[PDB]
């Protein structure tokens, strides 16, 4: 086996506005095998009501998933993305940031 | 103005050489229309795309037999490889294949792809002239000797060639006002203070198809590469695709710096300099 | 349209 750990990007579909609901994206690519645990944490809190896009993979075989789901930005609300793959000693827990 | 489709298949083993889990996907450019998940409770290959639904039942028949034909195939591999391997019966195997065909403007075939891939490294693939085949080592060796005893290579190219150039077409065609057009990027600039010394530009491009971009930073008209991040294109979620560059700049200096991006959906290339 | 040939690779 060839094992590759996971690439995490947190993002908005939109430009964050406080008060206007969007969608929070956690794109996890670059990672073998495909098996992977990806949640989205408000406050440090799962997310219930989260999906995922089909599996799908890049030209060096390495897979890639977008986790999303509908939120509304706020300016005390915290959001991260929490990623467990078989590559990751420890859960890796990427913090949003909206400048990025 | 070429296309492509591309159709993606993942079989990961489960624990005990159980009913392992298969997942198909397909492509128009970067745009997905079909899936197909072992895991789903409809077992059928499903829509994901508007100009795909349109297809009729007879349709949806063959393409949910000839991947239910591949996904089978793949299942015995699996176990064929995992005692080729001595390979613990308490974990889990891939077998990952990529194939699609490329069209030019007017339509004709340009070059096809099949290639294989066990446990995230090259398995076996057919070459750029759909004659014979680049295989891996041991295990690939003997699939290699089997397909050319075959001529396996035959059909292969008559597919990549034929069926899947004439449905190509016919999807470009369907959903023309969804594959053969180009959102623009929309742009603009943010400025982040790192000290009293320097701060980051960032150049963002939001809501640009297809996903093919260039982001280049200057300084005074000159590529400028040192102090540069660029994060790979993301998915939107909406059809879309975003991605951003970054530069620290010294303080007072950040209107030497410009911006350059390059899309197929702009008409002239575009230059942004902070203001 | 996908793959119509099934290969079986041993
Ligand atoms: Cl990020
Ligand atoms: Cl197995
Ligand atoms: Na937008
Ligand atoms: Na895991």
Redesign the interface.
Same mark, same amino acid.
């Given at each position: 086996?060839?094992?590759?750990t996971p690439?995490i990007?947190v993002?908005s579909?939109?430009?964050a506005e406080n008060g206007k609901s969007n969608?929070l994206?956690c794109?996890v690519?670059g990672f073998?095998? &495909? +098996?992977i645990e990806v949640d989205l944490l408000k406050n440090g809190e799962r997310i219930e009501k989260v999906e995922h &896009? +089909?599996?799908?993979?890049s030209?060096d075989?390495?897979?890639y998933l977008?986790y999303?789901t509908e939120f509304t930005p706020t300016e005390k609300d915290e959001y991260a993305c929490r990623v467990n793959h078989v590559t990751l000693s420890q859960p890796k827990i990427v913090k949003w940031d909206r400048?990025? | 103005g070429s296309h492509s489709m591309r159709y993606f298949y993942t079989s990961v083993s489960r624990p005990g050489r159980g009913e392992p889990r298969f997942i198909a996907v397909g492509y128009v450019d970067d745009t997905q229309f079909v899936r197909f998940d072992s895991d789903a409770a409809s077992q059928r290959m499903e829509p994901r795309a508007p100009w795909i639904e349109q297809e009729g039942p007879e349709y949806w028949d063959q393409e949910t037999r000839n991947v239910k034909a591949q996904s089978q195939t793949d299942r015995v591999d699996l176990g064929t490889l995992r005692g080729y391997y001595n390979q613990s019966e308490d974990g889990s195997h891939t077998i990952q294949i990529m194939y699609g065909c490329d069209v030019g403007p007017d339509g004709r075939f340009l070059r096809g792809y099949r290639q294989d891939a066990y446990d995230g490294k090259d398995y076996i693939a057919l070459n750029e002239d759909l004659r014979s085949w680049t295989a891996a080592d041991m295990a690939a060796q003997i699939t290699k000797r089997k397909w050319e005893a075959a001529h396996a290579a035959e059909q292969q190219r008559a597919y990549l060639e034929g069926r899947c150039v004439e449905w190509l077409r016919r999807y470009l065609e369907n959903g023309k006002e969804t594959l053969q057009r180009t959102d623009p990027p929309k742009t603009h600039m943010t400025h982040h203070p790192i000290s009293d010394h320097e701060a980051t530009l960032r150049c963002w491009a939001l809501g640009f198809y297809p996903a093919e971009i260039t982001l280049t930073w200057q300084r005074d008209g000159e590529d400028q590469t040192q102090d540069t991040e660029l994060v790979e294109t993301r998915p939107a979620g909406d059809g879309t695709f975003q991605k951003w560059a970054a530069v620290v700049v010294p303080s007072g200096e950040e209107q030497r710096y410009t911006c350059h991006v390059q899309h197929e959906g702009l008409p002239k290339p575009l230059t942004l300099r902070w203001e | 349209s996908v793959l119509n040939d099934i290969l079986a690779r041993l």
């Open positions: 086996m060839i094992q590759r690439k990007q993002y579909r939109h430009p969608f994206n794109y690519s073998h095998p &495909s +098996d &896009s +089909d599996l799908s993979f030209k075989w390495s897979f977008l999303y400048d990025m | - | -």
